[PDB]
Design a protein around this ligand. Structure first.
Ligand SMILES: O=c1ccn([C@H]2C[C@H](O)[C@@H](COP(=O)(O)O)O2)c(=O)[nH]1
Ligand SMILES: O=c1ccn([C@H]2C[C@H](O)[C@@H](COP(=O)(O)O)O2)c(=O)[nH]1
Ligand code: PRO
Ligand code: PRO
Lengths: 257, 257
């Protein structure tokens, strides 16, 4: 009884941000999130424009953007609306509730003003979600909980993963899914996004480990692949994005049957 | 065989940042870290100047500082040198190694350029330390690992805490201690800093829980208290800082015997 992305977008308990995302995934035949891990605004915006049609989401990394301004984010929003993708900020919210509330809304980045999605670690307990929600729910935003990590020695396993799933399921008005390596929730309203993805086997020199789109979407049951260096270190980033999109999309279609 | 702060500063395996910190704690009779959770540079700098003599450390929160500039941090460094306290940035590094390396060195904040200490969550595995170390060791910086958290529902317990201690003990060239609620390492070279501290019992509305300086330094064996609202919401923040300093210092002296 596995539903297509387009049918999941209509589920009774679906969050509006998840619904918007699932609808554009189905329309564009993409379940690829670009991890835009670049330090220059011009490169961020040129990638967003050229790859926009091929992606369902762009993961920003504002903490490394040397020439960040709120105007850069305005131009990114224009591209996101034009090409139809969501903006997901990488910042790892992972503090007591009172702190994440202020980190999400304020400072120089004003993340909640432009990010459709943010992610949080569950280690502080559910106050991390409650603090974020106090800013995000009035703004009609969503959050992803980090239930598993792709890196060597990850402690997001076993009971920790189970606690992340429970915290999501109990905060479904704001939490729309997970960063995970696999399907972790049985409820189809939740999105599973998986980083640590490359076409070829391997890793990096600092604990990253890769699995293929076919493995993580097809066998492990995740919904979306998050891809950084597999695309951004390639010469032709458009062609690379298309190879990842086609891989993730076919893997989804084959599992759906 | 519990050693004073001044003797711990001379231990063979002590990290230079820890040694500097332990020496000024002993000299100034303070084991208080101010959590400067304010949004205005003028308030940050006025607190740093007036409370500098009473603290061993100031925990900055640059992600909420509405008028951050690197010049603000230069003026903070002048005060830190004048009054003799370390600068500890609150940012919860909690990503794969390749990402934390860039987050620590770059973007608009350039944290490694001005922060003596940073803290990291251990959930990603030891790549989080290896990535930070690649920037921090050349800069002669130190790191604290979050082994326990003060908030309700914290998952930093049991095997997770044990993994944080092992990761610290195996990366002693860069990791100088812990954010924890108690002594977690038996090795006296490591510093234990404890947030969630107030003179009175209670908590906040978003999962924070408080224990007293006497409990966390005296009974639980921690070295330093981290105090935010107990000081910054008080009318006279200097008097409040002095009450917390005297509480934490006496608790340390009584345990030492
Ligand atoms: O468990 C996690 C959570 C986030 N990520 C983030 C970190 C980076 O920004 C991307 C992965 O980038 P890549 O260049 O594909 O290795 O996703 C991760 O790789 N693993
Ligand atoms: O486990 C932790 C780790 C960091 N903190 C940080 C969060 C805040 O910046 C301070 C606590 O501030 P306070 O106002 O004293 O509740 O320390 C914490 O409270 N608990
Ligand atoms: O056999 C394997 O696991 C890998 C997957 C990507 C290419 N070959
Ligand atoms: O009895 C207690 O635990 C609390 C501690 C702070 C003041 N009274």
């Amino acid at each position: 009884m596995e539903l297509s992305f387009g049918a999941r977008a209509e589920l009774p308990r679906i969050h509006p941000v998840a619904s918007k995302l699932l609808r554009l995934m189905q329309k564009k035949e993409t379940n690829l999130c670009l991890s835009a891990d670049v330090s220059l605004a011009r490169e961020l915006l040129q990638l967003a424009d050229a790859l926009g049609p091929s992606i369902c989401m762009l993961k920003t990394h504002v903490d490394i953007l040397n020439d960040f301004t709120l105007d850069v984010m305005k131009e990114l929003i224009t591209l996101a609306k034009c090409h139809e993708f969501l903006i997901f900020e990488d910042r790892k919210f992972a503090d007591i509730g009172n702190n994440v509330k202020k980190q999400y809304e304020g400072g120089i980045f004003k993340i909640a003003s432009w990010a459709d999605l943010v992610n949080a670690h569950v280690v502080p307990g559910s106050g991390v979600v409650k603090g974020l929600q106090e800013v995000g729910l009035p703004l009609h935003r969503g959050c992803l909980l980090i239930a598993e990590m792709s890196s060597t020695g990850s402690l997001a396993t076993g009971d920790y993963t189970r606690a992340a799933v429970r915290m999501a399921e109990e905060h479904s008005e704001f939490v729309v899914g997970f960063i995970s390596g696999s399907r972790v929730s049985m409820k189809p309203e939740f999105l599973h996004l998986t980083p640590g993805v490359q076409l070829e086997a391997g890793g990096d020199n600092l604990g990253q480990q890769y699995n293929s789109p076919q493995e993580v979407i097809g066998k492990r049951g995740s919904d979306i692949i998050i891809v950084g260096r597999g695309i951004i270190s390639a010469a032709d980033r458009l062609e690379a994005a298309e190879m990842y999109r086609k891989a993730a999309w076919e893997a989804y279609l084959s599992r759906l049957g």
